[PDB]
Design a protein around this ligand. Structure first.
Ligand SMILES: [Cl-]
Length: 392
């Protein structure tokens, strides 16, 4: 389990805002950091960075922004980002309503301006097709030139009944049963005109609506695909308690459901073993279920008193079996659900509530962020944190 071997590597805080997304490129040679706006705050640099692991350098990008009430541009929250499968480009989404495409030197190569409200989520297919979930209730599918980054095609993913109800598209994932079927696009909806929403499926090659998944209208908060791609979980908030659904990728049917007393679910997952399901909430704890006895929780994994939104980091160690969660006590806790007491150890402690945490797919990196702009990077490289050197 690589997590024991990860040692502090780099610390960074030039951040305007809180860092709320991190990405690694397929090769795990470069990473990118997106943070929020801060409404009254000075931010020369921020909120969009690209770093390089070999050179230990980092560069601030032109990013997303609007002109504030003084005529002086202010940065817009980065809502998602992901590196291209060809390793040349970075795709970003923000609260300026735009999808942008950047090359590895920070040059803007492409832009999608059709959306009329905040971008909320991005997903990327095996063939580098980009799915976009927009606050206006539309999803979009975008293709990009492999060598130039220019946006080549777009397609609207429209679920008219959701749109009638004024829902926002806020979650999005591709699905193809590990390459054994054609690409479908799952979209999760929620409602800011206020706990309603829904979960729908689209065909990606035709860009057409296929079905509503069989749940009540509920605000979906999180989507997680098992690494085997045999199934995924989706969590929602309801008028009362929260719910988690387990959905099969052959039938595209709801197979199992769990209920929790958590009133706001931030993240649901499935274990790497494929058998456990988790729900981490604003209550600063994670409920866990054995899917073969879904009646009652198997365990309850608690964090401590807030340093100040509860659990903002929840991931299984890639390639391993340990579960890792980060909460508003500022602690990253390590758990083994196969032990009678699952708590293993505190991995680290940050100066304030955790805002994001994520492993690289090759398990060689862990990045953890907290309120106030701190970003800690841990690597299989040892006692103290170094710095990146900022470049232009
Ligand atoms: Cl269904």
């Amino acid at each position: 389990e690589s997590v024991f071997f990860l040692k502090p590597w780099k610390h960074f805080n030039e951040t305007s805002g809180d860092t709320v997304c991190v990405a690694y490129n397929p090769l795990c040679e470069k990473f990118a950091l997106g943070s929020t706006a801060q409404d009254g705050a000075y931010n020369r640099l921020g909120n969009l960075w690209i770093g390089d692991f070999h050179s230990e350098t980092i560069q601030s990008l032109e990013s997303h922004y609007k002109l504030n009430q003084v005529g002086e541009k202010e940065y817009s929250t980065i809502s998602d980002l992901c590196f291209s499968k060809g390793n040349l480009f970075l795709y970003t989404g923000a609260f300026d309503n735009a999808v942008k495409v950047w090359d590895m030197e920070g040059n803007l190569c492409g832009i999608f301006n059709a959306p009329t409200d905040y971008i909320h989520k991005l997903a990327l297919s095996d063939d580098d097709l980009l799915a976009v979930a927009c606050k206006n209730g539309y999803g979009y599918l975008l293709s990009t030139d492999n060598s130039t980054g220019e946006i080549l095609t777009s397609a609207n993913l429209i679920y008219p009944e959701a749109l009638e109800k004024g829902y926002s598209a806020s979650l999005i994932e591709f699905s193809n049963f590990l390459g054994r079927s054609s690409d479908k696009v799952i979209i999760g909806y929620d409602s800011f005109h206020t706990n309603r929403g829904c979960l729908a499926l689209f065909d990606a090659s035709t860009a057409s609506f296929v079905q509503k998944f069989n749940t009540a209208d509920e605000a979906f908060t999180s989507l997680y695909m098992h690494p085997s791609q045999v199934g995924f979980v989706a969590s929602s908030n309801t008028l009362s308690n929260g719910r988690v659904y387990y959905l099969d990728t052959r039938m595209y049917k709801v197979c199992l459901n769990f209920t929790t007393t958590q009133k706001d679910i931030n993240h649901a997952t499935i274990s790497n073993s494929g058998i456990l399901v988790t729900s981490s909430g604003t209550d600063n704890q994670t409920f866990v279920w054995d899917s073969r006895k879904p009646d009652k929780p198997l365990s309850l994994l608690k964090h401590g008193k807030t340093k100040m939104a509860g659990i903002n980091m929840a991931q299984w160690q890639p390639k391993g079996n340990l579960f890792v969660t980060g909460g508003s006590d500022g602690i990253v806790k390590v758990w083994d659900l196969r032990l009678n007491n699952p708590f293993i150890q505190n991995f680290t402690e940050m100066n304030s509530a955790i805002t994001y945490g994520g492993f690289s797919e090759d398990a060689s990196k862990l990045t953890v962020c907290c309120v106030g702009g701190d970003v800690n990077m841990y690597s299989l490289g040892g006692n103290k944190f170094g710095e990146f050197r900022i470049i232009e």
